[PDB]
Amino acid sequence: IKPRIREILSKELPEELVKLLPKRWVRIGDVLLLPLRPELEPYKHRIAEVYAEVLGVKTVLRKGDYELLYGSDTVTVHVENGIKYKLDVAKIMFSPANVKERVRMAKVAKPDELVVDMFAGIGHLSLPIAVYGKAKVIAIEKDPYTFKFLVENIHLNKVEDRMSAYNMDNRDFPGENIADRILMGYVVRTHEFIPKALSIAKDGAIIHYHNTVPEKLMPREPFETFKRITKEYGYDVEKLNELKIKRYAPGVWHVVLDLRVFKS
Numbered sequence: 001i002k003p004r005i006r007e008i009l010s011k012e013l014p015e016e017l018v019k020l021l022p023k024r025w026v027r028i029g030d031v032l033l034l035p036l037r038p039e040l041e042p043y044k045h046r047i048a049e050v051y052a053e054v055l056g057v058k059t060v061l062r063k064g065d066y067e068l069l070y071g072s073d074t075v076t077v078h079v080e081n082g083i084k085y086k087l088d089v090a091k092i093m094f095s096p097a098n099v100k101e102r103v104r105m106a107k108v109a110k111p112d113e114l115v116v117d118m119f120a121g122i123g124h125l126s127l128p129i130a131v132y133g134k135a136k137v138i139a140i141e142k143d144p145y146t147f148k149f150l151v152e153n154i155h156l157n158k159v160e161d162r163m164s165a166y167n168m169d170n171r172d173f174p175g176e177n178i179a180d181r182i183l184m185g186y187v188v189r190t191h192e193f194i195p196k197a198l199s200i201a202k203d204g205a206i207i208h209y210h211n212t213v214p215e216k217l218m219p220r221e222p223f224e225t226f227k228r229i230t231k232e233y234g235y236d237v238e239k240l241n242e243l244k245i246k247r248y249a250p251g252v253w254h255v256v257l258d259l260r261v262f263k264s
């Protein structure tokens with residue numbers, strides 16, 4: 001099934017098009033991300049329709065952010081490694097192509113830490129910490145829509161007590177020298193937030209610093225740049241680890257560096 005899909009669609013599609021039907025897909029809650037060959041375009045909707053029924057999802061988006069192929073409701077709750085993540089699959093990014101990192105995050109924190117998530121999303125990286133590590137968490141999310149989900153996801157996981165949330169730009173965050181650990185899960189020229197990061201950090205704090213660097217420049221970057229910017233503040237940093245992740249071309253990785261900073 002396949003089989004079931006092939007039995008239904010073979011009735012409406014010439015055998016040549018049937019052969020090209022989608023063989024994989026991504027499922028997030030009850031929404032389906034479905035990739036489609038160009039020759040199947042004319043039949044977009046009907047194919048998404050049968051896939052929807054045999055796979056048991058309410059909505060199908062094109063994988064290819066996303067084009068609605070069948071259904072209407074893109075909000076769903078996705079469960080991963082014991083975590084509940086409500087989201088609007090069409091408006092908010094969330095790839096299991098990153099699940100390892102979300103798993104990793106479940107381990108790294110100690111119950112005592114204050115953790116600040118500078119780019120919270122719906123709780124991508126911070127929920128694992130609040131739930132498994134048990135530290136406290138201040139989660140910052142700029143987008144008001146995304147924010148609703150983050151707030152909700154906090155209840156859904158029963159951590160409203162130890163996790164708080166602010167709908168502002170991380171640069172306006174009043175805090176200073178509070179953070180034992182900072183999450184910088186963002187990849188658009190994130191070096192630009194290093195200064196607010198260092199401000200929010202305590203001396204010795206750990207920073208999970210995500211960025212997108214060309215492999216032309218590895219393994220020098222993105223650490224050199226993190227290093228030099230830190231110099232502008234007379235602080236130092238030690239590189240504790242550098243994981244590769246969604247190595248997503250053309251030619252550019254997505255890495256996360258674990259770094260400890262010292263406020264002199």
Ligand SMILES: C[S@@+](CC[C@H](N)C(=O)[O-])C[C@H]1O[C@@H](n2cnc3c(N)ncnc32)[C@H](O)[C@@H]1O
Pocket residue numbers: 093094095096098118119120121122124140141142143146168169170171185186
């Ligand atoms: C949701 S994470 C993406 C994680 C990744 N796509 C994944 O699958 O795990 C990026 C978030 O940072 C937020 N953001 C961007 N700039 C921000 C800022 N200056 N202050 C606070 N949040 C910001 C965006 O609203 C977005 O929700």
